[PDB]
Amino acid sequence: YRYTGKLRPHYPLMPTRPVPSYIQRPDYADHPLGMSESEQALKGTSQIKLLSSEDIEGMRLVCRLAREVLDVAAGMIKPGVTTEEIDHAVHLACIARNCYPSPLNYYNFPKSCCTSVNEVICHGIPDRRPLQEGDIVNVDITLYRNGYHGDLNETFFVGEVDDGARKLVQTTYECLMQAIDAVKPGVRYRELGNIIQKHAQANGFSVVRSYCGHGIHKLFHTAPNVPHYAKNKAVGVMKSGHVFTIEPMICEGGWQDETWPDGWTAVTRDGKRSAQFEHTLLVTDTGCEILTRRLDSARPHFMS
Numbered sequence: 001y002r003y004t005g006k007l008r009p010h011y012p013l014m015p016t017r018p019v020p021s022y023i024q025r026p027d028y029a030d031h032p033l034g035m036s037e038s039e040q041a042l043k044g045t046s047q048i049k050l051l052s053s054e055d056i057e058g059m060r061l062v063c064r065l066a067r068e069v070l071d072v073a074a075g076m077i078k079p080g081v082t083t084e085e086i087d088h089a090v091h092l093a094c095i096a097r098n099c100y101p102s103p104l105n106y107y108n109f110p111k112s113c114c115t116s117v118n119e120v121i122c123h124g125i126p127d128r129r130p131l132q133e134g135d136i137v138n139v140d141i142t143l144y145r146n147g148y149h150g151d152l153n154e155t156f157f158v159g160e161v162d163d164g165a166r167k168l169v170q171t172t173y174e175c176l177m178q179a180i181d182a183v184k185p186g187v188r189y190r191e192l193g194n195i196i197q198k199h200a201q202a203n204g205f206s207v208v209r210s211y212c213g214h215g216i217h218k219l220f221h222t223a224p225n226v227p228h229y230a231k232n233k234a235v236g237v238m239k240s241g242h243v244f245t246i247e248p249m250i251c252e253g254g255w256q257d258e259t260w261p262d263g264w265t266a267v268t269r270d271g272k273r274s275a276q277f278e279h280t281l282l283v284t285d286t287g288c289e290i291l292t293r294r295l296d297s298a299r300p301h302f303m304s
């Protein structure tokens with residue numbers, strides 16, 4: 001395999017971390033291949049679930065807990081810390097909140113969160129590599145509590161970073177927020193990508209096309225599929241009660257992605273940097289509720 005950039009995996013990985021049996025587990029947690037039968041049963045369907053008052057409360061709780069865990073991860077970002085150490089802290093933080101770390105064994109993913117550094121677009125596997133001054137790193141968190149999944153991610157600066165890194169991360173965050181500001185009943189899901197690409201392209205960046213936002217509630221990933229690029233064929237119209245994520249992945253160079261031999265790590269084919277931000281949203285009557293928002297601080301960690 002020919003690596004696209006300077007990053008390399010740092011093995012070996014620690015044995016998979018166990019989750020106490022008292023914590024409720026999603027169906028794929030015990031499947032030998034980590035398959036989710038509930039999700040597969042809906043593969044190919046574009047119908048979007050309309051959440052009940054009970055479902056909404058469940059989503060509000062898990063998303064609040066997920067934010068708490070991402071904040072724990074944020075507090076550990078500093079030169080020298082390895083992504084595996086971040087993952088260990090995340091794992092314990094989920095357990096402390098009586099939640100199962102959704103990524104764990106999802107289709108056999110080996111860790112409890114995704115850590116994506118520099119050229120890694122998404123799904124980076126926490127390993128033995130110490131973060132380096134100048135790196136940008138995204139930590140993607142998803143928790144499962146009482147049958148509901150809550151998902152979010154933020155990109156962080158490791159120590160001091162260059163101007164290119166600041167522009168990329170800032171622009172990516174703006175892309176997500178401009179998309180969120182457009183969410184409300186009546187809007188076509190395919191419209192979000194037009195908004196996102198417009199801002200990214202205006203700043204000389206590209207939009208990853210192989211990964212999209214997704215419905216989320218009792219299932220980790222389900223309808224609707226939400227592309228982040230312009231002129232996509234996303235199916236569906238927003239309606240009060242819909243819950244889904246927007247998680248734009250923006251790149252310094254081209255949008256092309258490829259996967260590492262580990263089967264998960266997605267990287268830019270040109271080896272340039274990528275950044276991402278994600279929130280889980282609930283469509284209301286007026287607009288939308290950002291379920292994974294910070295409640296005690298006005299801005300994301302990179303500008304705090």
Ligand SMILES: [Co+2]
Binds near residue numbers: 151278
């Ligand atoms: Co997501």
Ligand SMILES: [Co+2]
Binds near residue numbers: 140142153247278
């Ligand atoms: Co996520």
Ligand SMILES: [K+]
Binds near residue numbers: 116117118136138275
């Ligand atoms: K990255």
